[PDB]
């Protein structure tokens, strides 16, 4: 139960210090029913070429880090064959298998909260005073694969408490216990299909709740890598490639 292997497509992930697997809302990704669908054109289900593990950028965990987030359909729109299909097709649909990995040693300590927040809408500080109706820039609402850093993690940059973020599919990475978190997310939206460009079904939040710490001499560079794989990907409404 502490060891596990995730194989999908032509990619395999290994781990010897896992903490089980979470299946968001107790549901596995699935394809769209014939009665839940509307688009009449036959969709493309590329399978193995898009349903595989993509490893996005690595972040560095510092004793003062606040946390980061990634919007999901988004992080992959410019990567591999998944990205190509997401650009050529109007409609997209899929679940995800998210595997956040971060290892240290038996002498390091700290705890990361890895959670999935559906429809993660970002807010602004409203000019500090709260009298200015400002809005988050495109660079912040859809940060891409590089993710974005939280400025006010306590309120998740959206006026909501992070202490309650656990009502969402989550898992923790407690260095003294495990070195990775695995969460499987089904397609969640009020529509059977939607644009992979304009809409971000959910956001991945990785936030340090218990600060990283260690004594001088132990390796100081502790990376946090994000690996994710689409599941049951379906695309429809073919046309030319659109970036945004």
Q: Which residues of 70-90 are buried (b: 16+ CB within 10 A; e: fewer)?
A: bbbbbbbbeeeebbbbbbebb
d(CA 213, CA 13): 27
Q: What is the DSSP letter of 34?
A: T
Residues 6+ apart with CB under 8 A from 191: none
Residue 151 is inside which H or E element, if any?
A: none
Q: Which of 66, 58, 55 is nearest to 223 (CA)?
A: 58
Q: Is 194 annotated as a binding residue?
A: no
Residue 20 is inside which H or E element, if any?
A: none
Q: What is the DSSP letter of 218?
A: B
The two beta strands, 222-238 and 109-118, are: unpaired
At CA 60, angle to CA 159 and CA 14, rounded to 5?
105
Task: Return the number of other C-beta atoms located less than 10 Å from residue 40's C-beta.
Answer: 6
Q: Is 36 annotated as a binding residue?
A: no
Q: Is 57 annotated as a binding residue?
A: yes
Helix residue ranges per DSSP H, 59-125: 72-75, 80-88
Binding residues for Ca(2+): 57, 146, 215
Binding residues: 57, 146, 215
């Amino acid at each position: 139960d502490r060891v596990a292997q995730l194989t999908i497509g032509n990619s395999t992930i290994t781990t010897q210090e896992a903490a089980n697997i979470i299946v968001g809302y107790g549901e596995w990704p699935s394809y769209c029913s014939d009665d839940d669908a509307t688009a009449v054109d036959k969709p493309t289900r590329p399978d193995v070429s898009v349903n595989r593990f993509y490893t996005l950028d690595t972040k560095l965990w510092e004793k003062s880090s606040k946390g980061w987030y990634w919007k999901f359909p988004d992080v992959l729109t410019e990567t591999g064959v998944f990205g190509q299909n997401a650009q050529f097709h109007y409609l997209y649909r899929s679940g995800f298998c998210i595997h956040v990995q971060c290892n240290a040693s038996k002498f390091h300590q700290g705890a990361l909260l890895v959670a999935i927040l559906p429809e993660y809408v970002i807010g602004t500080v409203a000019g500090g005073t709260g009298t200015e109706d400002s809005h988050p820039p495109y660079k912040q609402t859809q940060p891409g694969a590089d993710g974005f850093e939280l400025q006010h993690p306590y309120v998740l940059d959206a006026g909501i408490p992070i202490s309650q973020l656990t009502v969402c599919p989550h898992q923790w990475i407690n260095l003294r216990t495990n070195n990775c978190a695995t969460i499987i997310v089904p397609y969640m939206n009020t529509l059977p299909f939607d644009s992979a460009l304009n809409h971000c079904n959910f956001g991945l939040l990785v936030v340090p709740i218990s600060p990283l710490d260690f004594d001088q001499g132990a390796t100081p560079v502790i990376p946090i890598t994000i690996t994710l794989a689409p599941m049951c990907s379906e695309f429809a409404g073919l046309r030319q490639a659109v970036t945004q």
